[PDB]
A paper describes a structure:
SPH1118 has been identified as a pectin-binding protein involved in both pectin chemotaxis and assimilation. SPH1118 shows high homology with the solute-binding protein (SBP) associated with the bacterial ABC transporter. SPH1118 consisted of two domains with a large cleft between the domains and substrates bound to positively charged and aromatic residues in the cleft through hydrogen bond and stacking interactions. Here we show tertiary structures of SPH1118 with six different conformations as determined by X-ray crystallography.
Interestingly, SPH1118 showed three conformations [SPH1118 (open form), SPH1118 (full open form), and SPH1118 (closed form)] even in the substrate-free state. The crystallization conditions of SPH1118 (open form), SPH1118 (full open form), and SPH1118 (closed form) contained the substrates (ΔtriGalUA or sodium PG). However, no substrates were bound to SPH1118 in these structures. The crystal structures of SPH1118 (full open form) and SPH1118 (closed form) were obtained only under crystallization conditions in the presence of sodium PG. Two molecules were included in the asymmetric unit of the crystals of SPH1118 (closed form) and SPH1118/ΔtriGalUA. Root mean square deviations (RMSDs) between two monomers in the same crystals were calculated, respectively, indicating that there were few structural differences [SPH1118 (closed form), 0.543 Å; SPH1118/ΔtriGalUA, 0.106 Å]. Compared to the C terminal domain of SPH1118 (full open form), those of SPH1118 (open form) and SPH1118 (closed form) were closed by 18.9° and 34.2°, respectively, suggesting that the domain of SPH1118 was flexibly opened and closed even in the substrate-free state. There are a few examples of proteins whose domains are closed in the substrate-free state, as observed in SPH1118 (closed form). There is little structural difference between the closed forms in the substrate-free state and the substrate-bound state. Further studies are necessary to elucidate the physiological significance of SBPs adopting the closed conformation in the absence of the substrate.
Author numbering: 2 to 610
């Protein structure tokens, strides 16, 4: 019954299609219609550090997968799975006969190797990635037979199936044991010979170079790394390539309802382009069949995109960002500026800084009026909605800001009109920002002038993305501006409400380091933050959905009371485009990294009309 692409008819070494598919392949229901084979999907990456663009184009192929409405997940690579009544035990059934891109078997051996020999190997990952932890506690992972793998957590872990559908939860399917064991000392007695044959000097760097990790550029730099991906790297990503080309995986493990082995589209070609203006011009000319990653957050792109739809042969669809805030102020409560810290740690000082802001002016100038004032909370339709976390201190009230700052003792003025500390110099805050995010830079420039009227100085420190993260983890900043997640994905990314992300919980990464190390590194958080961390552990280890619900709402209320991070606007709509000839794009899908959009729309069932 099963049929294949005409392009694979010419490969005479390939087995017949029913032997390359699993016995029971996953049947993909198309978004709008049954498709036809053929064509090259044209799309775009910006620069040499945009490998996630490939991931978000072809899609993470994890054990589970989001529904189109992102409310729940379904078995994906797993045929099915069970969960014990206590929710500590997850048993995954794999698809018998499934194969890697090189024709060799996909079995529990691969999942057990990826878990035990890579993810949970402490030489490879000194800090075990959090996706596979419950409150810091690791699972025991074992093979029950060739097509059954068991995960045993020391505590209840209701979120694990949702984790397995995010990009960061795809390790279990990322490593073929046979190829990857060559580069692992527990398997290759002569792993030293491979170190020389590469530019490395230890087995963890060897693994990263040859087998890679979720977000490493090495994931897309070679054709020989096996995968279960719908398309395989053919012309690879590299430090200075002008293009990337990917070709259908002849051993892909999915069919459409009529029995066609997917994908429909034969090839994907990514143009690798440096300056954003060339991407805008190429997109508005209709040279890309899909662009749902790069322009949509740039609000000045939208009028251009809409105007050229007919000219360029494309349709713009607007996506709903999952982030609660498009450009939020993370205030560092462990700032190294001692004089500043005595005010940073005071609730009412943070309240003043929010009251001295004009979110209508920010929306007008930097977001072309397409956003709306908001702080850090989930949106109204979320069951997590908290009004205070969303809407406190949104209206400009400069007279109240100035009264508060006076009450705090910041009444002495310097020769330039700024407030000073009672003992010290000018009230001045350093804010780090990625210079490429022009809207965020412009937001800070507007905040600087707004806060100038309260006698507060904002110093803007733009930088490359690399130095921006080095300053953060070095604890060398007072404010860092970036998105607040949580509008739609609060329990997937609670980092704005509790300091649990080591790179992004920038109310203090030192507090985050304390959480992640069980108190042995970092700086001890304040009582309200420790309280939220203990409740967070209870939340992730909750035994029922109703216990989880109460515990996470407690965390959100304490976050609202503390008011540690200051939102500017919730995001404007995210403007994406697809070629009019490209069928089966879910134009209603939300936008977000936890869903790896646009690949949430199942690009293996896109086709050309």
């Amino acid at each position: 019954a099963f049929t294949q692409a005409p392009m694979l008819e010419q490969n005479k070494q390939l087995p017949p299609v029913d032997q390359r598919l699993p016995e029971k392949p996953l049947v993909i229901k198309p978004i709008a219609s049954n498709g036809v084979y053929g064509g090259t999907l044209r799309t775009v990456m910006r620069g040499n550090a945009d490998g996630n663009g490939i991931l978000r184009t072809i899609g993470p192929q994890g054990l589970t997968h989001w529904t189109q409405d992102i409310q729940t997940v379904e078995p994906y690579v797993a045929e099915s799975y069970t969960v014990s009544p206590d929710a500590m035990e997850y048993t995954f059934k794999l698809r018998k006969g499934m194969k890697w891109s090189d024709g060799t078997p996909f079995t529990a051996d691969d999942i057990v190797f990826a878990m035990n020999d890579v993810v949970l190997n402490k030489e490879m990952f000194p800090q075990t990635p959090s996706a596979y932890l419950v409150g810091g506690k690791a699972p025991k992972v074992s093979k029950v037979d060739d097509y059954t793998v068991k995960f045993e957590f020391p505590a209840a872990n209701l979120s694990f199936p949702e984790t397995l559908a995010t990009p960061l939860g795809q390790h279990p399917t990322l490593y073929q044991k046979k190829y990857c064991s060559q580069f692992h000392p527990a398997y290759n007695k002569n792993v030293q010979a491979e170190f020389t044959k590469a530019n490395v000097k230890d087995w963890p760097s060897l693994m990263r170079a040859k087998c890679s990790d979720i977000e490493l550029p090495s994931r897309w730099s070679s054709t020989e790394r096996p995968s279960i991906d719908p398309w395989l790297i053919k012309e690879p990503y590299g430090g200075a390539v002008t293009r990337v080309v990917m070709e259908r995986n002849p051993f892909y493990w999915q069919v459409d309802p009529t029995g066609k082995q997917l994908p429909y589209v034969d090839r994907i070609q990514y143009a690798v382009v440096s300056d954003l203006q060339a991407i805008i011009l190429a997109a508005t000319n209709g040279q890309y069949d899909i662009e749902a990653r790069l322009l949509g957050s740039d609000v000045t792109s939208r009028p251009l995109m809409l105007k050229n739809q007919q000219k360029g042969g494309y349709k713009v669809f607007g996506q709903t960002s999952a982030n609660a805030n498009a450009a939020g102020l993370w205030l560092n409560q462990t700032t190294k500026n001692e004089k500043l810290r005595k005010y940073m740690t005071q609730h009412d000082f943070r309240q003043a800084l929010s009251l001295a802001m004009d979110r209508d002016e920010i929306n007008k100038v930097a977001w072309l009026g397409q956003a709306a004032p908001w702080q850090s909370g989930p949106f109204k339709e979320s069951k997590w909605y908290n009004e205070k976390l969303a809407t406190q201190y949104l209206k400009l009230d400069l007279a109240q800001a100035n009264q508060i700052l006076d009450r705090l003792g910041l009444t002495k003025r310097d020769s330039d009109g700024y407030r000073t500390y009672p003992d010290g110099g000018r009230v001045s805050l350093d804010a780090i920002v990625m210079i490429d995010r022009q809207a965020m830079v412009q937001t800070l420039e507007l905040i600087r002038r707004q806060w100038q009227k309260a006698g507060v100085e904002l110093v803007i420190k733009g930088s490359e993305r690399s130095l921006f993260y080095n300053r953060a983890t070095a604890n060398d900043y007072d404010i860092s501006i970036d998105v607040f997640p949580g509008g739609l994905d609060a329990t997937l990314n609670p980092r704005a409400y509790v300091a649990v992300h080591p790179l992004e919980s920038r109310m203090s990464l030192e507090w985050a380091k304390w959480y992640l190390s069980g108190g042995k590194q970092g700086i001890e958080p304040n009582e309200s933050m420790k309280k939220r961390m203990a409740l967070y552990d209870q939340f992730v280890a909750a035994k029922t959905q109703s216990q989880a619900l109460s515990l996470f709402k407690q965390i959100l209320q304490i976050s609202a009371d503390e008011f540690e991070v200051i939102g500017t606007v919730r995001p404007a709509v995210i403007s994406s485009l697809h070629s009019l000839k490209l069928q089966n794009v879910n134009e209603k899908m939300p936008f977000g990294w936890p869903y790896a959009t646009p690949s949430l729309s199942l690009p293996q069932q896109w086709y050309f009309s």
